[PDB]
Amino acid sequence: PRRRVIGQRKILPDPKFGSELLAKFVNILMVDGKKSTAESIVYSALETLAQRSGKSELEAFEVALENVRPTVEVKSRRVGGSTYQVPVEVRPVRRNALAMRWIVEAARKRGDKSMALRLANELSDAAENKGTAVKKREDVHRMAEANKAFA
Amino acid sequence: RKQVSDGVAHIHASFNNTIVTITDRQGNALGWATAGGSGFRGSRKSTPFAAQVAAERCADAVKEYGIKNLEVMVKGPGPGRESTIRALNAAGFRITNITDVTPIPHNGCRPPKKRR
Amino acid sequence: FCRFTAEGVQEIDYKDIATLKNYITESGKIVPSRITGTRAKYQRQLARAIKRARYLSLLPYTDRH
């Protein structure tokens, strides 16, 4: 990336109700290239959380990650010497990315019965501000907010 | 309390701390705060932000004096000396003037030879 | 870059702070000839004129007051 300032790569939407965001969620959950089982897992998890919550899948995803999407994150921009944690506010696509990836690692952990139930219950906890992914969000937010002395 | 009208605000801004103190016409202290006491023990207290936090925390404890307008007066170099002015302004004190008494020897004592 | 000493016969005096208060700054401290013209000879003569003024309290050493 020395000279490249390259942009983005095309991603096809949901084969169900079209959502680039849910497709990116599928691609963050996919392992070994198994896109079919990835999208199947996410489909069942969102439809189960949808029958639970009484909101459509899109709105459930929306205000269930909106409680995990971060604001500022920590970087190490060493200047005039030693390296210290400068908090950069995260761009919106980085928000989407970090949120989905924390939810997915949270679901990788927290093993109850099957990945579908894990992920579904997990973003329910993230909708009600209770899960390990939202705990990750708040712990990044207090990993920063204690280094504001650098701006 | 004592309903003091107006005052001066000394910012002893060093290379390590930034001592904010509030005093009056007669030169008597009403309260103070410092970037080392406001947290920021160490590498952060020599930053401009901790200085403004000290200025905010010293705007605290002088609300009880009804101090209306402040004569900010600074001293010495450092990361502070400007962010403390910003914070003493944004705290709602009518900054009536921004002077300093930063001391300059007329070639007096020999200074320490430090820092090889 | 005007040296008033170009037409100023009755060379620099320590009582004419009316004329001296232009060769100092807000603080009371002498100004450089590289910025105010003032041929070096008269800059030195007015330097000691300002010093004698300060001694007679016709000018402040600093603006501490």
Add this chain to the structure above:
Amino acid sequence: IKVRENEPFDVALRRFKRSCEKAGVLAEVRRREFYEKPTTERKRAKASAVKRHAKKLARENARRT
């Protein structure tokens, strides 16, 4: 070193500060006596000043274009 800065200010406006002395003397007198480096640094910077004057004299070039 002191300014009223009438409250219709909204400004720093303390260009008097970093234009007159504050840091020009303080951060270089804070330590370091050494009695001899003033002349060394003096003539390094003074060679650079005469070099600026040489630049101003011989600043006639072709821009490579």
Add this chain to the structure above:
RNA sequence: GCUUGAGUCUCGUAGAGGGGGGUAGAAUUCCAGGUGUAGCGGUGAAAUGCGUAGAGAUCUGGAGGAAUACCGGUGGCGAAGGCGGCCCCCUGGACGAAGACUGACGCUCAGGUGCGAAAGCGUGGGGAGCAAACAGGAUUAGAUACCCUGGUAGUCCACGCCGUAAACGAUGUCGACUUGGAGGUUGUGCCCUUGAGGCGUGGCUUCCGGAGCUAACGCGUUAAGUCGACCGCCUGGGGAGUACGGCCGCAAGGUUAAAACUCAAAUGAAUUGACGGGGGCCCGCACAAGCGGUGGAGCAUGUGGUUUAAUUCGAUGCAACGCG
């Protein structure tokens, strides 16, 4: 005899030139009090340290010591060391204008004499800051170093003494001559101050550069150019500016100054590289954002070692080890 060298005089100028004596203000520290509080300080981070006996902060008063912010300028003065607040006293030199006077009164100098930064030494004061030694903290593998907190001699004053420095433009002093450019500073003559001026000429002076010189870098009217006079000094590197002896010194040590022995080099300037915990620009899955692995287990295989009679031979840092 002579005036072109060298001086004397009359008028002034510029100056941190010198010695003596007063004095001012800022600032650091200390002392006493006022207000005020849990921090100050310091560092890369700390900790020693200081602080609830109430500090740091801010204010007033008092004491004392050292150096003089800005002016500040390759600016000035001085033989060199060196000298910078202001004022007074005694004092040296420089230099310009014009005129007069003496009439070679000159230049250079072994030995001799004198001045000679800083450290250091003796006697007596002084002691604010800084600070060898010293002590503590920290760093570190160790750290009797850098760093931090303290801190004694000392730095300060008078009077002696030492007599050395990279005391260095590493350039002995004096005189003559030989193209230039821009400056700085200090004199002075002329013309229109005609209105911040223009034309000459004296002194000191900084930088570029010509002929020349030089091994080259460079010097270049302030020569390292062309010469003249006198002085000092050198003769391969190490041993050695050492030893012995002399002279000086209170002491530290200084000055003069070898020999054996050993090496065939030591050295200068410049050139091409390579390298830098030097500078500028730039690139690579180099790092950063991310995914998946190795290192753990079992097995396959190659390797080292051991074994054996033989466990053929070869690759054996990246760039050998599922390699021939």
